[PDB]
Amino acid sequence: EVETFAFQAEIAQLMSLIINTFYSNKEIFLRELISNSSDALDKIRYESLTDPSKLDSGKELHINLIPNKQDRTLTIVDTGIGMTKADLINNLGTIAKSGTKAFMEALQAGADISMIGQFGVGFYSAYLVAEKVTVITKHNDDEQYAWESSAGGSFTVRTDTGEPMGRGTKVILHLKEDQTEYLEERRIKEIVKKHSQFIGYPITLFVE
Ligand SMILES: C#CCCCn1cnc(N)c2nc(Sc3ccc(C)cc3C)nc1-2
Numbered sequence: 001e002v003e004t005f006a007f008q009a010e011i012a013q014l015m016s017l018i019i020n021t022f023y024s025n026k027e028i029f030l031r032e033l034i035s036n037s038s039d040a041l042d043k044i045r046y047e048s049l050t051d052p053s054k055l056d057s058g059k060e061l062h063i064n065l066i067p068n069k070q071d072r073t074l075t076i077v078d079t080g081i082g083m084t085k086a087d088l089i090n091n092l093g094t095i096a097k098s099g100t101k102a103f104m105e106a107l108q109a110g111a112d113i114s115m116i117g118q119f120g121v122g123f124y125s126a127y128l129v130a131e132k133v134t135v136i137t138k139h140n141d142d143e144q145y146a147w148e149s150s151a152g153g154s155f156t157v158r159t160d161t162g163e164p165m166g167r168g169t170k171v172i173l174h175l176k177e178d179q180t181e182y183l184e185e186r187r188i189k190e191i192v193k194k195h196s197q198f199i200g201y202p203i204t205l206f207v208e
Pocket residue numbers: 036037039040043078080081082083087088092093123135147169
């Protein structure tokens with residue numbers, strides 16, 4: 001069963017701005033997603049100190065970057081805390097409302113899109129390079145879910161019967177036709193070195 005939801009109007013507006021604004025420095029999307037993965041890993045690590053059983057779903061804390069030219073996808077995988085159904089449907093978007101308002105005010109005052117992460121809404125920068133984003137996620141004590149959106153004001157959530165992932169999040173970027181440079185090994189390596197060189201978890205760049 002696939003459920004369809006409307007984004008909050010403010011989030012739809014943010015996504016439209018990201019898609020419509022002329023802005024060449026698109027590569028910053030990767031730093032934003034890696035940053036989110038790092039935060040998710042920090043969270044499960046912290047929680048595990050008081051409840052060690054939270055790592056029964058996997059002790060390894062890391063990030064994988066997986067390009068696939070045949071599917072035209074770049075996947076950012078982490079073994080962090082994951083997300084609940086409520087996270088996906090309501091709670092992350094609700095929190096994102098304040099950051100969105102502040103971000104759009106800052107842009108009018110002279111800020112640029114690269115600063116999106118300073119407002120806590122960096123996830124949506126995925127739409128700089130992706131025509132569709134699929135998020136597969138598994139949180140302890142909740143089921144595995146697939147969230148998906150091609151923007152246009154709506155997203156879907158379903159229980160995922162695909163390959164079980166243990167715990168964490170996979171952000172699958174279905175790249176725009178003119179953004180296939182982000183499938184190239186040399187390009188991803190360059191971006192990770194430029195913007196994500198001090199992340200406190202292993203980042204493995206898979207090759208094709
Ligand atoms: C980190 C932190 C913990 C919070 C949950 N969470 C966990 N792991 C990730 N890799 C996340 N990326 C986001 S941004 C985001 C915002 C909205 C939607 C719908 C999806 C995502 C992935 N949120 C994430």
